[PDB]
Enzyme design. Structure first.
Site, short mmCIF file in Angstrom:
data_model
loop_
_atom_site.label_atom_id
_atom_site.label_comp_id
_atom_site.label_asym_id
_atom_site.label_seq_id
_atom_site.Cartn_x
_atom_site.Cartn_y
_atom_site.Cartn_z
N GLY A 146 10.66 -11.64 -2.69
CA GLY A 146 9.88 -10.42 -2.62
C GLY A 146 8.59 -10.46 -3.41
CG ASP A 199 5.40 -1.34 -5.32
OD1 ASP A 199 5.56 -0.73 -6.39
OD2 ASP A 199 5.63 -2.56 -5.19
CE1 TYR A 202 9.23 -1.24 -9.42
CE2 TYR A 202 8.65 0.43 -7.82
CZ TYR A 202 8.28 -0.60 -8.66
OH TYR A 202 6.97 -0.98 -8.72
#
Length: 468
Positions: free
Chosen positions: A10, A118, A162
């Site tokens: 990621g 995001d 997160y």
């Protein structure tokens, strides 16, 4: 009790290729890991154009990758990040997501994940007229997707907050997390990264605090070795700072590797050891990791003398390459160690260089007639620094001769920059040490090349204030 343990692709940048992924799968099976999560940031059909359908060639590649994962018994999780532009009150978006996930499932994939990381915290007028809250819409669409897929055993959800630093006004009182925990179906796992986006260490109580909200043990998305927030950094140090007591309280651990594929070997190995301890000592884990890693360098290329020339007593010796040794790899590890600290040897080299710089005036000008003890101490410490710089240069030289050059070629730039700067520092230290009898400027060649070190980026970096 099943436990998730593995790697998440990621990071931003050039994505990994099929050969690298297959080799990664082989290594994961060797190291007794069980999870691979596929959410590459720069995959256009993953995040930015999720609505599109995969082509035939892409489908063949995905099927081959999934079958290879099946061969090595590594769970493969496919993620989608539709939160960039998805509208939650429009059934067409939901139908498109269902069709995409079904296309993925027909390739043989078993586990799926939805990520909302995001993204913005705003909602369109169409959704604000339907859902009471942003979290409500996210949870509703996630639940519907989960129920459509047939409730797979494994399913991952990444909340928008997160990390603790993104929780407002705090972790325990965040309405977003409370709503998510209340309204999310019990069968879904929740990603979490700790107090910060790049958490230096994880206190145990923080995990319990988060679990008191999400009402379930989380799955750790650890960016301890991520390097896409400042891509000048390479991290080769071991897994550190995470207490093993978290293992019973967690549903899984998933690591973000460095962008360079071959630079993560040690990290992954350390992680496996950290897990395998408690189904821990960072120093021993790093020693074992480097000992195993050295075997992949093989031996340097040498002249093949299978009527063969052999030099005589007065003939110039043949070019001979020295093998790469444990000390070179330990020095390399210390040079690129951790986001929040350096290796002991590199930190000691920096401290010694700073001390030498600070006390240049002891012998710089007209050292004769001054105190002998200071002169001897300064010269001795300078000599030790010179020897360490020579060790760095020899490390680079020996690494350049490896037969399996690929290991170096994926991280050539970092080692090359560090060896160049070490050479420049050695030259500068010599110039400082010879000032009492050499009044010439401290030049390299006829100039000072470090006036262009880093170019415009280096110049802008140099002007940023620091406390030290």
């Amino acid at each position: 009790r099943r436990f998730l343990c593995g790697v998440v692709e990621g990071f931003y940048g050039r994505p990994w290729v099929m050969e690298q992924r297959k080799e990664l799968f082989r290594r994961l099976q060797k190291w007794e890991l069980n999870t691979y999560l596929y959410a590459p940031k720069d995959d256009y059909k993953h995040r930015m154009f999720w609505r599109e359908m995969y082509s035939v060639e892409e489908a063949e590649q995905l099927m081959t990758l999934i079958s290879a994962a099946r061969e090595y018994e590594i769970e493969f999780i496919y993620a989608i990040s539709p939160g960039l532009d998805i509208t939650f009150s429009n059934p067409k978006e939901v139908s498109t997501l269902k069709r995409k996930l079904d296309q993925v499932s027909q390739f043989g994939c078993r586990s799926f994940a939805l990520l909302f990381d995001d993204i913005d915290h705003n909602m369109c007028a169409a959704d604000k007229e339907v859902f009471s809250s942003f979290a409500h819409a996210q949870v509703s669409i996630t639940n519907e997707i989960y129920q459509y897929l047939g409730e797979p055993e494994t399913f991952l959800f990444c909340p928008t907050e997160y990390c603790g630093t993104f929780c407002y006004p705090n972790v325990s009182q965040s309405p977003y997390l409370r709503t998510v925990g209340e309204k999310l179906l019990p069968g879904i796992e929740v990603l979490w990264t700790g107090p910060k986006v790049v958490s230096k260490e994880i206190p145990v109580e923080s995990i319990e605090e988060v679990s008191k909200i999400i009402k379930r043990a989380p799955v750790i998305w650890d960016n301890i070795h991520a390097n896409d927030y400042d891509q000048k950094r390479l991290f080769l140090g071991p897994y550190k700072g995470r207490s093993t007591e978290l293992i019973p309280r967690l549903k899984g651990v998933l690591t973000n590797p460095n962008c360079e594929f071959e630079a993560n070997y040690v990290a992954i190995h350390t992680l496996a050891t950290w897990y395998k301890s408690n189904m821990y000592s960072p120093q021993m884990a790093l020693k074992l990791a480097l000992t195993e890693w050295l075997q992949e360098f093989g031996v340097p290329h040498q002249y093949s003398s299978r009527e063969q020339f052999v030099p005589g007593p007065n003939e110039k010796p043949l070019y001979t390459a020295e093998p790469v040794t444990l000390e070179d790899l330990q020095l390399l590890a210390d040079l690129f160690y951790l986001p929040y600290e350096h290796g002991p040897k590199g930190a000691q080299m920096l401290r010694e260089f700073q001390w030498l710089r600070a006390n240049s005036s002891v012998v710089s000008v007209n050292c004769k007639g001054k105190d002998s003890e200071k002169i001897e101490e300064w010269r001795s410490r300078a000599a030790k620094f010179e020897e360490m710089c020579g060790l760095v240069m020899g490390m680079f030289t020996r690494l350049s001769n490896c037969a399996n050059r690929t290991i170096l070629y994926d991280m050539y730039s970092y080692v090359w920059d560090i060896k160049s700067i070490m050479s420049m520092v050695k030259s500068f230290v010599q110039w400082l040490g010879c000032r009492s009898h050499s009044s010439a400027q401290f030049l390299i060649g006829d100039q000072e090349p470090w006036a262009f070190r880093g170019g415009l980026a280096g110049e802008f970096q140099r002007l940023l204030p620091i406390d030290g």
